[PDB]
């Protein structure tokens, strides 16, 4: 009955959803043909012939990456009109996908949202997978999240967005498209899980011993997170959480809705069987700064709220004994207006490994979604880049000549400058 | 419930430690896969001493393997029982030490111990009751001596009240295998005396003589020598894992065998050794084993018991035997060797008995001696050091890296102090 509608925008959304929807097929035991050989109803809607079709949306402005899905292994699982393709991409520009090319395809995408909501007898909310550094994932997303808020008022709008990395980078003008998309992620969003690519490049190096990873090695680690978050809705457990339930325990103010994502344990198949994976050890790897999936150190910042999602053979006694060890650590600091900062969600099912995967078969796992004040440091290095190039008026004619005014550059800097200003005000001890 | 952490340093120490892990895995009935295959239920009662449980009912050893080269590490990993170890504890460098104590202790070994102590702390601070440490190495090299004694110094520094058992292969008169061996032997005793509780000496010439006369083997390879060392090694710690009538742990032996804080170098032995030519003709009795202990040919160091005096004797028997014959025999040997044992210490001999013999034999005995006759090895090492140091040969390789000349004279002074203490307490009424 409870079910989620996933939205994938950009090239990142299609390729994250390529390695995400292969695990929803494998967790529920659904073949690529679309048939099995009530938990599956959260994403798979039954057909009278026995077929299960995902309730997702795939959006891009180019057909170069979705046509590979249409001619791949899963060409029969997805609905033919469920994958919307444009004809021309936005090409690293926020102006293109928000004003000029993003308008002719939004009528088809918004029609499928109104159709997928009709079969849903009860809808919990939306999940978004996109990228800040692109033209579609940040330009087409910016008016879609504006459009979804008007039609559906109080629905939850979660987000799994690819934050730009601190050092490595792909596009030249990613600080412009990162600035102007944060205006729509503040009032038209509800809770935004960011990850980047450098912090997962570090993980596959020193943990899984893979010297040369790709995106299909990164995408399955991101695909492991979202299946841990949703795991309470699908399978029976000692204490389930809900999408509305864990926003209340994690967002204290409507402008402070930016957590961090962490997953542990992450070890290969050979290294796992010589070690013992206790409940205390998996909950202690998450608090290390080397397992952050965003390049920020939480020693500089202060924890505000946290949530623990558990899977497998976990006993509630050892969770209480391991959390109480954490609270005696002087390294981990909490802000004085949150004396109780832990939310615990326990699920029975141990995680499943994919064939050809890099992670090992494990009995228990944990995924912490930590809100912290050490993200204003990450937002400092992006405005150090933005005004360093806006002062010389570089690349501005690409934006003004397509449909916005030049005044959107000044306000969107002034919009999120006060957003960093609000983080040190929260961090003051009461 | 008492735990011992094992460390393997140097090529000789690595190979002896691998043979030790094979021997005690066969004793406890652990196949190299990591499961349990035994017939008696007494093997699994005390397996937390040497092994950690893993996920899926498997067992892993509680040892770390450190060497500055990747050769012997690969040999151990590709060996018979190399699968049971854990791959995160395989800490190694790239550049060889070249049998240079300065390279082992000051430059190349300085950057690796920051990672060595991390896994040592991981395997140690999770233990319930850490009994002590057990390290395997050799004196005459640059890796087995330098970073070995460095690890001893730092572990003694950070755990003040524990016990250390360092099993060291020592230089020998006729079987010299290194050119700078007096220098790298004298440079490590300065740290071995200060920060070690029991140092067990092993001599290659004694192993060769045992394999030629008592065992009468025609081809005594290094596998056979390392098996002898490992079989003597496991005997002193049988009593921490197996039941018996008169139990005696490592601190029991330490208190009974260390009368003065700087006399803790021990000469060990195995007692039921025999050739299969005369195994049919030899009878296994407690008096026969008792006579077998005190044979000079049995002694696994190149020192004569006839050229000194005995401070303390320890004997750990294994098997089913009565106690009156043991006490009577090990009083009779002290009575018959009246002029050799010291008169200011009556009751020189401690006996312990365990209920489980080694596999393949009805009974066994491990003999450990602390005697004043061990001063001959230190005397000849000091004489070789002085003969080399008069002309300062092979010294620029040490002085060109950060080693001063005066530490050599300090180590020579400590050697002279040690042999002076031996002679003074030998000649005292």
């Amino acid at each position: 009955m409870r079910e989620c509608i996933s939205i994938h925008v950009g090239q990142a959304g299609v390729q994250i959803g390529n390695a995400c929807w292969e695990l929803y097929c494998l967790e529920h035991g659904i073949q690529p043909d679309g048939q099995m050989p009530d938990s599956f109803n959260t994403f798979f809607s039954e057909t009278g012939a026995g077929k299960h079709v995902p309730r997702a949306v795939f959006v891009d402005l180019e057909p170069t990456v979705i046509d590979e899905v249409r001619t791949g292994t899963y060409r029969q699982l997805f609905h033919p009109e469920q994958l919307i393709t444009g004809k021309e991409d936005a090409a690293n520009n926020y102006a293109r996908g928000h004003y000029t090319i993003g308008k002719e395809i939004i009528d088809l995408v918004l029609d499928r949202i109104r159709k997928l909501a009709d079969q849903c007898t009860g809808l919990q909310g939306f999940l978004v997978f996109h990228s800040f550094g692109g033209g579609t994932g940040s330009g087409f997303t910016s008016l879609l999240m504006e459009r979804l808020s008007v039609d559906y008022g109080k629905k939850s709008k979660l987000e799994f967005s690819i934050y730009p990395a601190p050092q490595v980078s792909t596009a030249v003008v990613e600080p412009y498209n990162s600035i102007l998309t944060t205006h729509t992620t503040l009032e038209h969003s509800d809770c935004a899980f960011m990850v980047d690519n450098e912090a997962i490049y570090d993980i596959c190096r020193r943990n899984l011993d893979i010297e040369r990873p790709t995106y299909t090695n990164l995408n399955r680690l991101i695909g492991q997170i979202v299946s841990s978050i949703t795991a309470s809705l699908r399978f029976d457990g000692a204490l389930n959480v809900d999408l509305t339930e864990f926003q209340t325990n994690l967002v204290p103010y409507p402008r402070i809705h930016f957590p961090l994502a962490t997953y542990a344990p992450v070890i290969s198949a050979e290294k796992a069987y010589h070690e013992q994976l206790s409940v205390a050890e998996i909950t202690n790897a998450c608090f290390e700064p080397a397992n952050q999936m965003v390049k920020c150190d939480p020693r500089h910042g202060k924890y505000m709220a946290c949530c623990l999602l558990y899977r497998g053979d976990v006993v509630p006694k050892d969770v209480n004994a391991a959390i109480a060890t954490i609270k005696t650590k002087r390294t981990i600091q909490f802000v004085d207006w949150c004396p109780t900062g832990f939310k615990v969600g326990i699920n029975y099912q141990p995680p499943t490994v994919v064939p050809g995967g890099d992670l090992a078969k494990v009995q228990r796992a944990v995924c912490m979604l930590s809100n912290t004040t050490a993200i204003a440091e990450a937002w400092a290095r992006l405005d150090h880049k933005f005004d360093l190039m806006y002062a010389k008026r570089a690349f501005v004619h690409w934006y003004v000549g397509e449909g916005m005014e030049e005044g959107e550059f000044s306000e969107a800097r002034e919009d999120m400058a006060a957003l960093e200003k609000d983080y040190e005000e929260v961090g003051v001890d009461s | 419930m008492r735990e011992i952490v094992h460390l393997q340093a140097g090529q000789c120490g690595n190979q002896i430690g691998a043979k030790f892990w094979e021997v005690i895995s066969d004793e406890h009935g652990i196949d190299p896969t990591g499961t349990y295959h035994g017939d008696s239920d007494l093997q699994l009662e005390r397996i937390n001493v040497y092994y950690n449980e893993a996920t899926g009912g498997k067992y892993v050893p509680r040892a770390v393997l450190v060497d500055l080269e990747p050769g012997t590490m690969d040999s151990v990993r590709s060996g018979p029982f190399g699968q049971i170890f854990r791959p995160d504890n395989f800490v190694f460098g790239q550049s060889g030490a070249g049998n240079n104590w300065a390279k082992g202790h000051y430059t190349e070994g300085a950057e690796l111990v920051d990672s060595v102590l991390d896994v040592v702390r991981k395997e140690a601070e999770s233990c319930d009751c850490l009994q002590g440490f057990q390290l395997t190495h050799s004196l005459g090299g640059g890796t087995g001596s330098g970073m070995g004694t460095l690890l001893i110094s730092k572990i003694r520094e950070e755990y003040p009240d524990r016990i250390m058992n360092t099993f060291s292969v020592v230089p020998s008169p006729k079987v010299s295998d290194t050119v700078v061996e007096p220098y790298n032997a004298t440079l490590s005793v300065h740290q071995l005396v200060e920060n070690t509780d029991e140092t067990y000496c092993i001599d290659n010439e004694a192993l060769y003589d045992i394999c030629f006369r008592t065992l009468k083997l025609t081809t005594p390879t290094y596998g056979d020598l390392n098996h002898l060392v490992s079989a003597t090694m496991s005997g002193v710690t049988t009593c921490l894992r197996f039941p018996g009538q008169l139990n005696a742990d490592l601190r029991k032996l330490a208190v009974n065998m260390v009368p003065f804080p700087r006399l803790h170098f021990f000469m060990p032995g195995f007692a039921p050794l025999t050739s299969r030519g005369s195994q049919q003709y030899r009878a296994l009795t407690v008096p026969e084993l008792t006579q077998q202990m005190f044979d000079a040919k049995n002694m696994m160091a190149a020192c004569d018991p006839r050229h000194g005096r005995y401070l303390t004797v320890a004997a750990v028997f294994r098997g089913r035997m009565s106690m009156k014959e043991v006490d009577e025999q090990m009083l009779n040997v002290q009575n018959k060797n009246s002029s050799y044992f010291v008169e200011w210490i009556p009751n020189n001999v401690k006996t312990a008995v365990c209920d489980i013999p080694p596999r393949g034999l009805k009974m066994s005995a491990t003999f450990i001696g602390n005697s004043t006759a061990i001063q001959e090895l230190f005397k000849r090492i000091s004489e070789q050091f002085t003969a080399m140091f008069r002309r300062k040969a092979f010294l620029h390789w040490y002085t060109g890296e950060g080693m001063d000349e005066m530490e050599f004279t300090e180590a020579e002074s400590n050697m002279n102090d040690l042999v002076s203490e031996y002679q003074q307490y030998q000649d005292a009424t």
């Binding site: 013992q276 205390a280 050890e281 | 005390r46 937390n48 791959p87 991390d118």
Partner: peptide, 29 residues
């Protein structure tokens, strides 16, 4: 690394291996 996880306290072992509080865990059976 694999040592990057905490060194932790206590280890479960199994039921035939006797450890501290093996008697107290046996007493509830």
């Amino acid at each position: 690394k694999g040592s990057l996880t905490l060194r932790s306290h206590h280890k479960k072992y199994s039921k035939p291996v006797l450890v501290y509080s093996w008697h107290r865990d046996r007493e509830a059976f």
